[PDB]
């Protein structure tokens, strides 16, 4: 059995087992960093039945919970928040902070949106490219969805620079151990104090919202708050940057394709639909662990063993998504869903707010910026580490 996670085939593309095994052995096993095996599945179908089957838990302290590295095993021991639940505990404890997220809330959320990219890109404009290129990642791409997420929690608007530094600082690849555990201390400690803030004076942010329905009637307390909170936070931020970065990297890779958005803004929705699928950036959260024997394909799933649903894998199924490998934002769509952000319950809560941020950015970064150039080779972009998720580090531009 192979080593799992595999590594990435080069910088962009998803790693080179998948497509082998999508033709060949479709639901095999692969070998864990602890030694022990776990169930791969990579076709578009057999993820959607993992995700939804009713025989699978995401209770990691179950036998057999497929963890990846140490540190999730010993994260196993914390109490959970509603992503590590199965029903009804998941959509009791997720509800209460899903109002925020809903397309219609999303949708009254876009003037908030447009301003926060607009005021970042026309800072961006004012310190200008007039001695070397700039990171749009530390200039753009990290505080548009950080300001954002931490606005929605509740920071005010003089604590965001910080805290924006401190959480880039724990998925830094360059961060010592010491470093990434003080960055994260130091977000913790940040959210408990303004969690007793907002139980005395509540305002109009998801904190004070969790604080006056459910903290102080009991069903939730504090510190199931905090957590809940810094889950909202850490769960979509890092990911959300390098969708921005990938995004960027990808037109810069498919002139053609700029040349259409730069023409028609309003591409900027089917762009970012193909961008999801095509740089599936969060590729190993949909894991479980089977509660009883399932079949999937011709393979026997033994109770208490652990699968893994490579959705990387499914938004490139040749038989759900023609030409899958070809980036196509103008390509027809098929009944299937993408699966970028999961599938079925434990489908990403903020879906709909990644998106119109991502559209929002799309349709208004080459109207600003309509000269904005890669100033590296494109061979030279310093992507994530091939055994992580795609993403970027950093991306110097000039404008
Ligand atoms: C492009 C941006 C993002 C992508 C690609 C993405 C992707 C995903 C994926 C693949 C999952 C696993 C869903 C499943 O189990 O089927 C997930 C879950 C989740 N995501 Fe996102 N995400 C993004 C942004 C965000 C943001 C901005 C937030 C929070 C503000 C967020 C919060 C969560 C949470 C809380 C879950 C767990 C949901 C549950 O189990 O009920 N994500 N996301």
Partial sequence: APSFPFSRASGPEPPAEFAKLRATNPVSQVKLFDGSLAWLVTKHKDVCFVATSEKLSKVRTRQGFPELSASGKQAAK????FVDMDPPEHMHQRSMVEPTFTPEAVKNLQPYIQRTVDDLLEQMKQKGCANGPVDLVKEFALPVPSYIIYTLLGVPFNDLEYLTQQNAI????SSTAREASAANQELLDYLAILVEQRLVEPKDDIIS????????PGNIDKSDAVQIAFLLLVAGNATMVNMIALGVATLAQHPDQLAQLKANPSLAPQFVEELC??????????????????????????????????????????????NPDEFNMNRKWPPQDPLGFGFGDH?????????????????TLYQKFPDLKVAVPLGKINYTPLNRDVGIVDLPVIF
Avoid at 78 to 81: C, E, G, L, R, S
């Fill in 209 to 216: 919202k969790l604080c006056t329905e459910q903290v102080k």
């Fill in 277 to 322: 699928r095509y740089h599936t950036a969060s590729a190993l959260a949909i894991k479980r662990t089977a509660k009883e024997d399932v079949m999937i394909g011709d393979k026997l799933v033994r109770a208490n063993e652990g699968i893994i649903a490579s959705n990387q894998s499914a938004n490139r199924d040749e038989e759900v998504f023609e």
């Fill in 170 to 173: 724990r998925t830094n690849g």
């Fill in 347 to 363: 489908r990403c809560i903020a879906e709909h707010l990644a998106k119109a941020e991502l559209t929002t950015v799309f349709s």
């Fill in 78 to 81: 914390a109490k959970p928040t």
